[PDB]
Amino acid sequence: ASLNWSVIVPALVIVLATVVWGIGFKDSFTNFASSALSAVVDNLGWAFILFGTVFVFFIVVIAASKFGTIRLGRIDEAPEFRTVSWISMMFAAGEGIGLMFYGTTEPLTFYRNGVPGHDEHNVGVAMSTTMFHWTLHPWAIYAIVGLAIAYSTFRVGRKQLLSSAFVPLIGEKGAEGWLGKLIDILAIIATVFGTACSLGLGALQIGAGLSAANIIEDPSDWTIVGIVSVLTLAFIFSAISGVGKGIQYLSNANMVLAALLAIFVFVVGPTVSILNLLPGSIGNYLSNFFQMAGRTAMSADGTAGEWLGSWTIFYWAWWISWSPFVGMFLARISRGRSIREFILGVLLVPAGVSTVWFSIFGGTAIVFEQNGESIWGDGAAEEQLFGLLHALPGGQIMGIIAMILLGTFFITSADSASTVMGTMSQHGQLEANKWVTAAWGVATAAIGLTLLLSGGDNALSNLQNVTIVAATPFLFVVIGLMFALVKDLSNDVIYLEYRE
Amino acid sequence: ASLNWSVIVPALVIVLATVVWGIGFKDSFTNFASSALSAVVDNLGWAFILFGTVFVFFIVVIAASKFGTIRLGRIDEAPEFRTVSWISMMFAAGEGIGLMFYGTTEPLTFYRNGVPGHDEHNVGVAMSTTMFHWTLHPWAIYAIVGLAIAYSTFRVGRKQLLSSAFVPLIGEKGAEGWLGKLIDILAIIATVFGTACSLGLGALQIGAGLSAANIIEDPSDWTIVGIVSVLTLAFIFSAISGVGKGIQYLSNANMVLAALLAIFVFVVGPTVSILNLLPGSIGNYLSNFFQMAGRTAMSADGTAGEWLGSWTIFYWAWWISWSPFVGMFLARISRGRSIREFILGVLLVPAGVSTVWFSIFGGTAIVFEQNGESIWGDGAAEEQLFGLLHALPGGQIMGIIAMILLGTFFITSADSASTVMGTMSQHGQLEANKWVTAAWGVATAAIGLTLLLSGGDNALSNLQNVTIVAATPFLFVVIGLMFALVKDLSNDVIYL
Amino acid sequence: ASLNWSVIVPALVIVLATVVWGIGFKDSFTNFASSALSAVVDNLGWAFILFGTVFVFFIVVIAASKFGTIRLGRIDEAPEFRTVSWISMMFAAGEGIGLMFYGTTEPLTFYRNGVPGHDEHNVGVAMSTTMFHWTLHPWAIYAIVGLAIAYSTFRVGRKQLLSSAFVPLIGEKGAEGWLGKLIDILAIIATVFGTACSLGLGALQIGAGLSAANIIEDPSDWTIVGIVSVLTLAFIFSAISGVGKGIQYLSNANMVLAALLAIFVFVVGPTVSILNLLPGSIGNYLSNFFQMAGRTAMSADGTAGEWLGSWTIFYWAWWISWSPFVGMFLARISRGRSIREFILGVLLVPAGVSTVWFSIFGGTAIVFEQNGESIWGDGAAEEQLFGLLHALPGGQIMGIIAMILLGTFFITSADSASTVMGTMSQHGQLEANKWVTAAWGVATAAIGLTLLLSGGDNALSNLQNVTIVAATPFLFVVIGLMFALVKDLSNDVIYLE
Numbered sequence A: 001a002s003l004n005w006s007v008i009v010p011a012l013v014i015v016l017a018t019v020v021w022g023i024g025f026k027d028s029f030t031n032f033a034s035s036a037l038s039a040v041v042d043n044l045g046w047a048f049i050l051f052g053t054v055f056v057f058f059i060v061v062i063a064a065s066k067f068g069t070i071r072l073g074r075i076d077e078a079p080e081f082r083t084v085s086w087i088s089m090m091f092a093a094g095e096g097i098g099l100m101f102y103g104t105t106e107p108l109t110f111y112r113n114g115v116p117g118h119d120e121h122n123v124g125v126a127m128s129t130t131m132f133h134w135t136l137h138p139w140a141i142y143a144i145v146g147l148a149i150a151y152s153t154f155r156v157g158r159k160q161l162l163s164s165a166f167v168p169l170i171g172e173k174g175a176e177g178w179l180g181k182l183i184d185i186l187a188i189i190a191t192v193f194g195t196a197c198s199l200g201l202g203a204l205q206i207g208a209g210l211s212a213a214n215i216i217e218d219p220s221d222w223t224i225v226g227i228v229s230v231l232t233l234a235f236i237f238s239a240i241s242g243v244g245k246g247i248q249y250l251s252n253a254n255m256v257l258a259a260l261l262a263i264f265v266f267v268v269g270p271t272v273s274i275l276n277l278l279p280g281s282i283g284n285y286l287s288n289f290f291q292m293a294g295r296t297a298m299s300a301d302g303t304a305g306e307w308l309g310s311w312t313i314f315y316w317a318w319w320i321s322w323s324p325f326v327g328m329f330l331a332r333i334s335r336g337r338s339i340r341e342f343i344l345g346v347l348l349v350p351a352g353v354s355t356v357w358f359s360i361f362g363g364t365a366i367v368f369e370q371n372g373e374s375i376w377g378d379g380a381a382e383e384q385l386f387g388l389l390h391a392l393p394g395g396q397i398m399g400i401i402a403m404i405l406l407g408t409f410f411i412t413s414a415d416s417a418s419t420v421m422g423t424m425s426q427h428g429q430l431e432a433n434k435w436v437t438a439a440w441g442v443a444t445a446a447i448g449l450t451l452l453l454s455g456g457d458n459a460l461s462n463l464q465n466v467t468i469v470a471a472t473p474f475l476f477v478v479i480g481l482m483f484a485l486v487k488d489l490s491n492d493v494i495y496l497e498y499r500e
Numbered sequence B: 001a002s003l004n005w006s007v008i009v010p011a012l013v014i015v016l017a018t019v020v021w022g023i024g025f026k027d028s029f030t031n032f033a034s035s036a037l038s039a040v041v042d043n044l045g046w047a048f049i050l051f052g053t054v055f056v057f058f059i060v061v062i063a064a065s066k067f068g069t070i071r072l073g074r075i076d077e078a079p080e081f082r083t084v085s086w087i088s089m090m091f092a093a094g095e096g097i098g099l100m101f102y103g104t105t106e107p108l109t110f111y112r113n114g115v116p117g118h119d120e121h122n123v124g125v126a127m128s129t130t131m132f133h134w135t136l137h138p139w140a141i142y143a144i145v146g147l148a149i150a151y152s153t154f155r156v157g158r159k160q161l162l163s164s165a166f167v168p169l170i171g172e173k174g175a176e177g178w179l180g181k182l183i184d185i186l187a188i189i190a191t192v193f194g195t196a197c198s199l200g201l202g203a204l205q206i207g208a209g210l211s212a213a214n215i216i217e218d219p220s221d222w223t224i225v226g227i228v229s230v231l232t233l234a235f236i237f238s239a240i241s242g243v244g245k246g247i248q249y250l251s252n253a254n255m256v257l258a259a260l261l262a263i264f265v266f267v268v269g270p271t272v273s274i275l276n277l278l279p280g281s282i283g284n285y286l287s288n289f290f291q292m293a294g295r296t297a298m299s300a301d302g303t304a305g306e307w308l309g310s311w312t313i314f315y316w317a318w319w320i321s322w323s324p325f326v327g328m329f330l331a332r333i334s335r336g337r338s339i340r341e342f343i344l345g346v347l348l349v350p351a352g353v354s355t356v357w358f359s360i361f362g363g364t365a366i367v368f369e370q371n372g373e374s375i376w377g378d379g380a381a382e383e384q385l386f387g388l389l390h391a392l393p394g395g396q397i398m399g400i401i402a403m404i405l406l407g408t409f410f411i412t413s414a415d416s417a418s419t420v421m422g423t424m425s426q427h428g429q430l431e432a433n434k435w436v437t438a439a440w441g442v443a444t445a446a447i448g449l450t451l452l453l454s455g456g457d458n459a460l461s462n463l464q465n466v467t468i469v470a471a472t473p474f475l476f477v478v479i480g481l482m483f484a485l486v487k488d489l490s491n492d493v494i495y496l
Numbered sequence C: 001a002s003l004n005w006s007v008i009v010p011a012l013v014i015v016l017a018t019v020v021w022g023i024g025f026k027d028s029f030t031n032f033a034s035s036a037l038s039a040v041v042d043n044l045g046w047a048f049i050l051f052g053t054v055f056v057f058f059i060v061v062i063a064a065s066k067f068g069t070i071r072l073g074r075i076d077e078a079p080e081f082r083t084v085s086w087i088s089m090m091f092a093a094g095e096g097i098g099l100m101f102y103g104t105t106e107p108l109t110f111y112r113n114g115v116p117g118h119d120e121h122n123v124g125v126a127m128s129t130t131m132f133h134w135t136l137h138p139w140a141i142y143a144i145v146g147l148a149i150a151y152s153t154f155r156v157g158r159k160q161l162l163s164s165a166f167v168p169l170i171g172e173k174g175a176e177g178w179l180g181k182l183i184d185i186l187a188i189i190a191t192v193f194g195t196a197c198s199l200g201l202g203a204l205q206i207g208a209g210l211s212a213a214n215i216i217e218d219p220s221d222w223t224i225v226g227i228v229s230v231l232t233l234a235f236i237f238s239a240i241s242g243v244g245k246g247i248q249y250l251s252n253a254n255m256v257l258a259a260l261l262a263i264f265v266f267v268v269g270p271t272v273s274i275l276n277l278l279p280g281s282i283g284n285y286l287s288n289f290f291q292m293a294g295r296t297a298m299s300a301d302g303t304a305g306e307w308l309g310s311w312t313i314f315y316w317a318w319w320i321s322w323s324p325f326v327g328m329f330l331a332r333i334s335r336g337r338s339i340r341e342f343i344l345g346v347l348l349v350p351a352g353v354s355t356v357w358f359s360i361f362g363g364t365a366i367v368f369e370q371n372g373e374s375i376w377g378d379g380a381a382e383e384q385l386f387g388l389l390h391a392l393p394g395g396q397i398m399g400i401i402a403m404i405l406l407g408t409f410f411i412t413s414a415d416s417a418s419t420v421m422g423t424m425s426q427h428g429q430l431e432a433n434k435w436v437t438a439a440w441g442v443a444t445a446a447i448g449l450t451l452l453l454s455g456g457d458n459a460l461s462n463l464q465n466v467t468i469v470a471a472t473p474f475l476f477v478v479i480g481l482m483f484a485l486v487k488d489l490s491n492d493v494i495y496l497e
Ligand SMILES: CCCCCCCCCCCCCCCCCC(=O)O[C@@H](COC(=O)CCCCCCCCCCCCCCC)COP(=O)(O)OC[C@H](O)CO
Pocket: A131, A135, A136, A282, A285, A286, A338, A340, A341, A342, A344, A345, A346, A348, A349, A350, A351, A352, A353, A355, B057, B061, B065, B066, B495
């Protein structure tokens, strides 16, 4: 039960500096994030865009190559979980607060405003651009990290860490040396800022959903939502035990409430129009896939840079930062799975759920816009969902259910991430200290709250700007994780049985 | 060997008492078809569009998988036909009447009017859209149904029926039970209306051809009756005379006459422009494939719904209703082949023939539009081919040949389909009774004539409306045929 | 190996006839080239466009098939060049002069004027259209011709000749008869005119560079003669002297000066914008690949014919002319490599260089257009690189390096191609006589000069018209080489490789 204090102190110190900086110096912190956002988006936006699509190609090649047959674990090892059970668990890997936050807003803004290189009121571009940010690019990054940890821990028996995946390139001297520790420090920092963004989005949307109950104010979002969801629920469940019996119950509530919320909009909404957006979004996603993969700051005659920072480069930075958690989560539930089957399940099942989600919620909002009724309202992204729900019969009750669903994603997402952060701080130990897991949840919630407070009126922008800067160092870890992964697969397994 | 009357009577009652009484109540029939068409297109257009493209993906994955090495028959068994006879045998089946009917109009109307999401006068979109409805989506449906029948009756030795292909899902108890009969009844009803649509188009075009040749005035309802009555009688005489040499004489004449017509327009039309369209049709088809596959009733800002019901959803329903006949036809001529070579041949050979055919007739009509000439006339879809032909030297002679070519496709299509329905009503008997074969052909021509007579001015609209309604029940059989086929393929003798 | 006078003469008099016709009768030569260009583009433009993309599919389908594992050489053979070295030699047999000439002009032209079916000021279309003409279509032709030559020479032990690759179709007797001689004659003629075009572009740009550097008042007709005479003489000295140290030293300078030029523009130019165009050009290339593959004279409502004849049908003809040389060059350095390794290396490595090259020079030129500057100037295609350089600090000294780089490309392009021509006029001898190698290089320079002199104010247009006519016969040799390569490879799987 040793603690990697050399990995805790660096990653921890950076968090407190961000929390201290964003509270007493909101102006200075806001300026730096805006300034740093500009430097990263200009000088490295190509790197996010270029390597975003390299990940999709790289993981498809790996699945279709000889490496697909490799089995994550002992040869002829039965998977620990059934296929249907394994499929049902990836839903806990999904981004339930981002899907709820951007379920209506994203396809609606693309429809209302258009995207660079396209005109307004284009349904296919609206749905295809949303599927770009949510289906394959996010889950190619998670597959790469999940595959690297799965192979290292199961097929090679190495420590469950991000640095253990780099043993092929830097060996054990680097993995336990300065470079290995740096890779593990950047993984914790990325997870804190990747998770903090979702917690901040959820707190923002719950605050908008409470408009029916109370008027919104800074303290309502600041203390009430933040402290209540982080304290009464996250700490208590974690402190009581590693498996508090609440996270398993709440993980069920996330599945049940999400399905009921989708079914209510699907049934009570424009059912036929939603079913039209199923093949419409998949077809237009595949048609425009490379047209959006090649959209850079020089697209639209050079005017695409501002849009990309808000939408595409933010999502790429967000996915890159969530990779250490989602990679660890997918690795755990995929022992004994083949590489080809692991990639196919991870790539396609989450893509199918995101497609259906945005068709129901994105399609319903677009249908309203077409008919004249606009749920746009003022335009804030945190109240588009509750505008959509209030526009259907029974919306008041389901609007309350959406608030409860967000609350259970806040606790579930914090507990799932804090568990991985504890593993990285205990030399890859599967069962981590209750206090260590609690502390990482507090820090992540403190970061997500500080981003909201510092931003003020532009709370969402400060949330997005900080995530891009925090995910930049780990973009190069994922790139080097592709080279390490090929060396690992090519070195051990091939020579094991057939070649030698 | 005996007749399955539990399948004939349910199918005959729907064909006889329900539809063929569209001559007694035309106003009532048209309203139902219009109302039923709106219900299907609105509430189930997504299903046709979504699963039309899944068939293409599913069939490509089957060939690319380890299943492609399975032989359709006994292991290490050679194909019965040569790869040249086999490939030329695919030139039977086929639309034939649909290619002549829509050979000129479909690419021309898309050029004149455009398509949802695109502006008019786009040659790439006009030709890519035509290739969408005729090359891969139709022949992925046929390959699935043909592959399921070929696998069940050749490798596994089951009966040659649609229901026998569902034994993996429903078991032998189901295949002989209520569900097995329902699948066979739906297969017959789909084939009757899928073929009745082709016969209706063939009779409409022959009526337009006769007026264009000045033999008759504008064709009336009685003239259409004579065409269908005369052609069906010629079909009966061949069938009831026994095993006749006439049908193969007509099947060969279809190849020569169809090729003679395509060569004439190619050599006499804008050869260079037609040739330019061969890369243009194929390149733009692959460019827009998924853009067209993602076109739904709420594309073009909720404006593609009317267009889809007339053009895309009609074809998908038309192909799904054709699948039982073309599936059985492909199974017979593909014994001993591998799944990979069967799929690739079925997918690509018709894709190349359709691409070349529409380039000669779609391209020639579009070239006239650009130059200043125009074969649109009054906009009727049945008179465009003869407008194209009469616009070229020697057009009068070749216009007659087009009518002759349509007449032979009528008998060839009625007989080829009536043979499959006879097999479905005789527990999979290949050598079906000649009397049952003639009965199914008469009903098909009676249904086609009813759709034309009922529609009146909007004769085409009534053909397309009823076809979409008839094919909707069989859309879910083909969806289930994918699950049945995969289970069957997985549980092969080589591996369980 | 005795000289093949039955092949030299038919290919020589056609070369000699072009020189006399194009020098003493400039007016008649240009009229025939324009008339013949229209006939070829109108009646066979479909064939160039159809089969340009069939080559890409064919070569990809061969690498991914069971043939991908076949080794180019005796079984269990190892390549004599490391993968790093083998990749380095790929840069030789690249255009060099073509990249230098069209590095700035092509992407800038499409951005400013647009392409059929698209509007102006489209960076994605401008960059993808340039990638269409330089990345996969050219190198799918070179991989087909190089693979066919490599397989028949190493795996089968035939002669290092193009007609030897048709033995599966026309038998051993056929390769020695008229049909085999015809393929050899066409292969030489195609190489001479494909090489003359690159040399003609090189002398056209050098004359522009001299004027841009104020060394000379203007590039008169005699100025172009002086450039070609000086550079062709230097090529002769290297071949006659027998000292290969000179050429290998020049070949290294090409990589050093080319990389130096590219890095200078990358660093002093808009670096961030250049980096944006890397994913932007690759992504928009894969998006539009089939839209551009389907572009014919019937596109844009029947208005793309003139554009295609100038841009796409010229490049397809130009690559078909370069095929015999790049085919032999690739085969020589690709011994012991599997089919899959050869196809992947040949397709992807040169595609990577071209994407970077046009992003640096095309992207810099486009960025100047956006900001209000414009290196377009008079619109002359041979002065756009030097307009781009003089717009950057230190571009006057770097303008000289661009000219010296053009000259070294001129010397090595002539020597590299004439070596292949000498080989294929001496029964496939690996090292033919230096005198015969020098004779073919001089003949190549004479046509390049003749096309430039005959064209006059339309020198560039004359080069393209003649290149399209010369490559038309060879378009069918490459088409049939696909049917001969599959037949030859299949006989190996019977051998089981
Ligand atoms: C939740 C909403 C719906 C989601 C829908 C997605 C469903 C995905 C579920 C995937 C399950 C896990 C993946 C299982 C793959 C198995 C890998 C494997 O082992 O190879 C097999 C599978 O290989 C394949 O052929 C892959 C299937 C084709 C995949 C093509 C998918 C195309 C879809 C892309 C659409 C575009 C995506 C858009 C995203 C928005 C080969 O089978 P075999 O019979 O040889 O196996 C051996 C046998 O048992 C003897 O021992």
